[PDB]
Every structure is written in structure tokens, then in C-alpha cells.
Amino acid sequence: MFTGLVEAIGVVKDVQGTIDNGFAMKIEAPQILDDCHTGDSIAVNGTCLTVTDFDRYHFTVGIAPESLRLTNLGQCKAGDPVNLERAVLSSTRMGGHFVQGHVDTVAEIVEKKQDGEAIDFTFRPRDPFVLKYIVYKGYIALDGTSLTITHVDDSTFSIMMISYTQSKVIMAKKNVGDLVNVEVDQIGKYTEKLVEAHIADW
Ligand SMILES: O=C(O)CCc1nc2c(=O)[nH]c(=O)[nH]c2n(C[C@H](O)[C@H](O)[C@H](O)CO)c1=O
Ligand SMILES: O=C(O)CCc1nc2c(=O)[nH]c(=O)[nH]c2n(C[C@H](O)[C@H](O)[C@H](O)CO)c1=O
Ligand SMILES: [Hg+2]
């Protein structure tokens, strides 16, 4: 479980494996390894992954084919920066929201323009149906970043990235064409089943 408040930006140091069988990945991130333990859950670009080994400077993870299929981790190369956030089990969320780290799909950046001190991003999800769980002013996690929806229609959604965030996440420097991990606010899927189980009586 996470908050979507990215703690640091690590750097991929080694990637081995294949798209069909899985990746073994090594990440440099001393900033968040002071309290590491094998088995811990760490979100890499919003993808919850299990620590398989670590030291004061690096930690490794095993990435399953399905994780690589639904996220941008399949494109990872040594040298790439990634958003990182350590797990936390808390029933409270005063900052960010309830991010599970279970990515729904990827979205392509289709527009990026400056609006004052903020950056206006527009994304096109590979799986349009996730848009049914996205609403104006609602939450969403992009590459593990908790953000506020500023616009949404039948094929895209947008967010505004403020100055404070631009220096904390990899999104700031991504461009049109790049992919980001999308995790819609889980509550939406919950209310969907609620109405379904509801009219399941009507
Ligand atoms: O909660 C736990 O105890 C398990 C942690 C965990 N680990 C991995 C992993 O190590 N490798 C993985 O490849 N996946 C893990 N996952 C699932 C992963 O996040 C998911 O496939 C993507 O987000 C796309 O939806 C995990 O949930
Ligand atoms: O809790 C709320 O109602 C606000 C949600 C929220 N929105 C944004 C945003 O829209 N743009 C943003 O640029 N940031 C938002 N943030 C903060 C952002 O996640 C954080 O700076 C990074 O992850 C690094 O820790 C938000 O928390
Ligand atoms: Hg998880």
C-alpha cells in the first residue's frame, strides 16, 4: 500500500531477462535503503514490487511478465530514472490517496504545455475503459504519483503538475509519446460493483 507521494527517484543499474519470461532488475537508491528488508514492497513507477535482495546502495526485484505487459517497466534500461516509494500500512491518508501499486494500464502522453508555473499534461490510455473510473477533480496515480484530474473525456484525461512536484518525479521530463503507468483510484471499482450488486436485486 502506498500514498502516491513519491519519496525519491532511483536509477536502474542492471536489467536482465526477457519480456516473455520476466526481468531481474537492480536499482540504485541509497536514499531509501536505510530500513530495507528482504520481502519488503516498493513501488517503482507506481508498480508494487518485492525486494529480493539489497545493500546500502542497491535493491533488486523480480518483475513478472504480466507486470511488464501492463506497465512501462518492460522498457526499462540501465540508466533510466524511476519513481520510488516505500510501502506503508496505515488506515489514514492525509496526503496522496490509497494507492495499491497495482497498475491498470499504460497511457501515452499526447500533449504537454506550460500553464504559468505548472505543466499541463494530457494522456491517452491504452485501455479506454479505465476512463469510467476517472472523474473531474478525482485522484489518480501516474507512475506512482498522486495527481488531481483536471479534465477527462471519452479518450483522454489530464492533470496539472505544480512547481513543487516537477523536481520530485520523472514525469516532469517525459514528452509526447512516452508512456506512464496508470492506476485509477480503487474506490471507483468498488462503487461500480456496489451498483451492480444493487440492481442485482432490482
Ligand atoms: O503485496 C505483496 O505481498 C506482493 C507484492 C508484489 N510483488 C510483485 C513482484 O515482486 N514482481 C511483480 O512482477 N509483481 C508484483 N506484484 C504485482 C504487480 O504490482 C502488478 O502485476 C502490476 O502493478 C500490474 O498490475 C506485487 O503485488
Ligand atoms: O490530496 C489532494 O487532494 C492532492 C493530490 C495531489 N495532486 C497533485 C497535482 O494535481 N499536481 C501535482 O503536481 N502534484 C500533486 N500532488 C503532489 C505530488 O503527488 C507529490 O509532490 C509527489 O508525489 C512527490 O512527493 C498531490 O498530492
Ligand atoms: Hg502491493
Identify the CA nearest to 7 among candidates 26, 37, 24, 30: 30
Round to whole Å and give the CA distance between 138 and 43: 21
Q: Which of 27, 56, 89 is the last residue of a domain?
A: 89
Round to whole Å and give the CA distance between 166 and 173: 8
121 and 202 fall within a common domain: yes
123 and 73 fall within a common domain: no
> Which three cell numbers mark 202?
432490482
Active site residues: 2, 41, 48, 50, 64, 102, 148
Q: Which domain holds residue 154?
A: 102-202
Q: How many CB atoms lie within 10 A of CB 23?
A: 19
Identify the CA nearest to 162 among candidates 172, 152, 151, 176: 172
**Phi and psi, residue 71, nearest 5°:** -130, -175
How many whole angstroms from 185 Cα to the centroid of ligand 2? 14
Across the strands, what pairs with 24? 16, 62
133: left (phi over 0), alpha (psi -120 to 50) or beta: alpha
Round to whole Å and give the CA distance between 68 and 125: 16
Q: Which of 42, 68, 89 is the last residue of a domain?
A: 89
- Whether 64 is covered by a domain: the verdict is yes
How many whole angstroms from 111 Cα to the centroid of ligand 3? 30
141 and 165 fall within a common domain: yes
81 and 142 fall within a common domain: no
Across the strands, what pairs with 116? none
14 and 56 fall within a common domain: yes
- Whether 94 is covered by a domain: the verdict is no
Say what the resolution is, in angstroms: 2.1
How many whole angstroms from 165 Cα to the centroid of ligand 1? 26
Q: Which of 62, 89, 116 is the last residue of a domain?
A: 89
60: left (phi over 0), alpha (psi -120 to 50) or beta: beta
**Phi and psi, residue 137, nearest 5°:** 70, 10
Give ligand 1 pocket residues (Cβ under 6 A): 41, 47-50, 61-64, 66-67, 70-71, 101-103
- Whether 66 is covered by a domain: the verdict is yes
Round to whole Å and give the CA distance between 82 and 94: 24
| CATH number of the domain within which 45 lies | 2.40.30.20
| Method used to obtain the model | X-ray
End-to-end CA distance of the chain: 35
Q: How many CB atoms lie within 10 A of CB 117?
A: 10
- Residues flagged as binding site for 2,4-dihydroxypteridine: 4-6, 48-50, 62-67, 101-103, 137, 146-148, 160-165
